[PDB]
Amino acid sequence: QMNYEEVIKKYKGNENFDHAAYDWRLHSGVTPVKDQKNCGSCWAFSSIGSVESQYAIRKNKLITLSEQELVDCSFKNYGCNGGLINNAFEDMIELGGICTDDDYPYVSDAPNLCNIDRCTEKYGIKNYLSVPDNKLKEALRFLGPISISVAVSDDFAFYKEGIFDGECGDQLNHAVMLVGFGMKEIVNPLTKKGEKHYYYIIKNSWGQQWGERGFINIETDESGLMRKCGLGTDAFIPLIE
Numbered sequence: 001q002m003n004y005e006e007v008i009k010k011y012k013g014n015e016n017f018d019h020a021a022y023d024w025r026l027h028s029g030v031t032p033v034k035d036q037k038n039c040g041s042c043w044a045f046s047s048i049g050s051v052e053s054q055y056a057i058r059k060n061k062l063i064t065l066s067e068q069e070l071v072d073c074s075f076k077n078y079g080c081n082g083g084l085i086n087n088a089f090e091d092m093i094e095l096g097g098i099c100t101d102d103d104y105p106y107v108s109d110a111p112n113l114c115n116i117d118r119c120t121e122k123y124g125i126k127n128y129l130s131v132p133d134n135k136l137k138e139a140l141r142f143l144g145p146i147s148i149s150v151a152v153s154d155d156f157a158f159y160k161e162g163i164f165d166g167e168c169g170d171q172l173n174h175a176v177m178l179v180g181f182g183m184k185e186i187v188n189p190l191t192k193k194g195e196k197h198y199y200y201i202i203k204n205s206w207g208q209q210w211g212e213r214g215f216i217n218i219e220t221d222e223s224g225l226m227r228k229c230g231l232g233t234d235a236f237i238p239l240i241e
């Protein structure tokens with residue numbers, strides 16, 4: 001099932017890397033945000049997202065995949081009423097690929113039937129691995145976007161721009177994607193001095209209407225270990241090589 005410390009070398013080598021910014025939105029690494037509408041199925045959109053990114057990097061093809069199929073057929077995940085990321089990736093391999101999002105479109109909380117035969121050629125993974133709670137920035141820069149868990153509040157929903165570090169949550173309650181890291185030098189309005197504010201860049205599952213054209217940023221530090229709102233305690237990324 002592979003581990004970080006080995007697979008890292010396959011790509012990292014070991015240059016050490018600018019911990020300030022790398023953003024997959026800009027190197028053919030980020031597929032478009034989608035809207036899970038009413039239905040608690042982020043676990044599905046997060047996982048399907050992370051693979052969509054691996055395909056667009058490691059084999060440079062654009063694909064939208066049926067997160068619906070996943071809800072209907074992933075049995076170690078409890079449909080629209082929740083699920084876990086690894087469980088998805090496990091069920092993913094068992095199914096041996098998922099249908100194009102066109103042959104098998106998404107329909108939110110509408111009851112639908114698992115139907116493997118609905119499409120012709122399918123798109124699989126080969127394995128998945130877990131990321132340690134620290135080497136995040138190292139992972140992203142070299143491996144790609146990640147699927148991760150997080151704790152959320154109602155303050156959270158109303159986000160619309162800039163750095164957020166507001167109210168978190170009691171325990172992890174939503175699954176989404178890491179897509180990079182960055183930094184804007186912003187001037188402390190009181191001391192009025194060059195302060196470097198580091199942020200993680202994120203993709204959600206609530207439409208382009210929400211946040212920054214669908215995304216949202218969160219403060220952190222240069223090392224990348226400020227994991228605000230229990231960031232990435234569960235954290236896996238899919239591989240196809």
Ligand SMILES: CC(C)C[C@H](NC(=O)[C@@H](O)CC(=O)O)C(=O)NCCCCNC(N)=[NH2+]
Pocket residue numbers: 039040041042043078080081082083084085148149150172173174175234
């Ligand atoms: C990575 C995990 C922690 C995320 C998750 N949180 C949720 O809110 C899910 O309903 C998915 C969602 O989109 O909201 C979740 O599924 N939590 C519970 C996991 C246990 C299985 N879920 C059941 N039995 N409802």
